[PDB]
């Protein structure tokens, strides 16, 4: 009457080099655009 086996992961090695067409790198670039964009002197999207 046992429960589920569970699957989980943890980052260990660097892996292959990142690719621009990879979804994770596109998400990271979008995140950097949200955080670091400056219109005149303000973080407009972060504050928004």
């Amino acid at each position: 009457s046992f429960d589920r086996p569970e699957i989980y992961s943890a980052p260990v090695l660097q892996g292959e080099s990142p690719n621009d067409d990879d979804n994770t790198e596109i998400i990271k670039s979008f995140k950097n655009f949200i955080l670091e964009f400056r219109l005149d002197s303000q973080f407009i999207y972060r504050d928004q």
């Binding site: 009457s1 429960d3 569970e6």
Partner: protein, 130 residues
């Protein structure tokens, strides 16, 4: 000063006092008294009746009841409910062994007695669920 009460029967059965050879398909869905010899007995196995589970995220106990066709004399619509590993909200469930209930189950084989059996023929037997 909770388990439902059961019934046993004694006395004369008349045409229902039979042997494993004398058991026929006309006696199906009838109460029969059958005398013979026990030849094979199975391992006593527990059968899960109610499983109790714990959700640690909500800290709550859930349960599920299971029935099979041998438990009830009348047939029912078979609704096979799987063993729950999620609650309704997706939280992981852990089995609470010891709070679940298991009923002992056995199957025996009753063959007609070698003194009441014909001397040359192969014997006839029947399974009995206890």
């Amino acid at each position: 000063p909770r388990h439902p009460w059961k019934l046993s029967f004694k006395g004369s059965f008349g045409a229902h006092a039979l042997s494993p050879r004398t058991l026929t398909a006309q006696h199906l869905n009838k109460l029969v008294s059958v005398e013979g010899i026990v030849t094979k007995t199975s391992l006593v196995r527990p059968k899960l009746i109610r499983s109790v589970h714990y959700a640690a995220k909500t800290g709550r106990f859930h349960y599920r009841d299971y029935t099979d066709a041998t438990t009830t004399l009348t047939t029912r619509i078979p609704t096979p409910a799987i063993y729950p590993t999620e609650d309704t909200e997706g939280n992981k469930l852990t089995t609470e062994y010891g709070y679940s209930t298991f009923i002992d189950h056995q199957r025996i084989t009753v063959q007609e007695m070698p003194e009441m059996a014909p001397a040359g023929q192969l014997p006839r037997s029947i399974d009995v669920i206890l």
